[PDB]
Amino acid sequence: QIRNPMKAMYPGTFYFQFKNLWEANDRNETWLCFTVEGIKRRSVVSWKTGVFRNQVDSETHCHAERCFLSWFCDDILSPNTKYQVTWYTSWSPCPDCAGEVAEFLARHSNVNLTIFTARLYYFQYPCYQEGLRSLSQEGVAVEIMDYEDFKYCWENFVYNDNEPFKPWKGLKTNFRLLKRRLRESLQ
Numbered sequence: 001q002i003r004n005p006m007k008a009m010y011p012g013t014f015y016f017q018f019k020n021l022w023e024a025n026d027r028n029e030t031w032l033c034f035t036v037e038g039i040k041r042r043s044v045v046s047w048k049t050g051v052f053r054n055q056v057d058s059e060t061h062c063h064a065e066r067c068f069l070s071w072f073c074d075d076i077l078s079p080n081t082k083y084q085v086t087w088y089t090s091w092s093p094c095p096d097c098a099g100e101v102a103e104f105l106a107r108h109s110n111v112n113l114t115i116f117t118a119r120l121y122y123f124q125y126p127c128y129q130e131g132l133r134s135l136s137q138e139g140v141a142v143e144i145m146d147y148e149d150f151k152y153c154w155e156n157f158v159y160n161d162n163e164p165f166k167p168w169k170g171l172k173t174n175f176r177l178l179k180r181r182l183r184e185s186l187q
């Protein structure tokens with residue numbers, strides 16, 4: 001094992017990598033932002049934050065989602081405590097990652113997960129849709145990042161230097177196109 005989570009991201013990187021505008025081209029990296037929240041009946045700690053990143057193809061299946069899964073198991077896990085994991089990924093989980101998550105979930109009954117995504121990854125091919133569809137069936141929330149989501153990420157995973165979040169042109173219209181697409185696919 002090697003991977004430990006980064007604490008945050010640079011404003012240059014975040015604005016580049018989380019662009020939901022139809023630049024399906026050059027973005028050849030996957031970026032995962034998470035929050036992990038422990039609850040011992042009275043909603044105590046833990047609270048954890050971080051950033052995982054990943055090359056889309058080389059390497060593969062030490063994917064940003066697995067990196068998180070692997071790290072989360074050893075370094076964070078506590079018996080008999082309700083967890084609330086939240087992901088904000090730049091690309092949609094591949095079916096493999098999606099399948100590996102479902103397996104991780106059945107093993108850890110005391111953990112819940114929601115995923116927010118900026119773009120939908122390789123979504124014309126059935127395998128990738130099935131993966132998310134499977135997560136929908138396994139009980140996982142899969143959502144498209146709206147305004148308040150990109151802002152939340154700025155307020156949590158970026159070295160923002162006290163600057164406020166500032167949306168890109170057509171962020172809102174992208175969001176809806178991606179919402180309908182995801183809606184139709186998870187019906």
Ligand SMILES: [Zn+2]
Nearest residue numbers: 063093094097
């Ligand atoms: Zn994957």
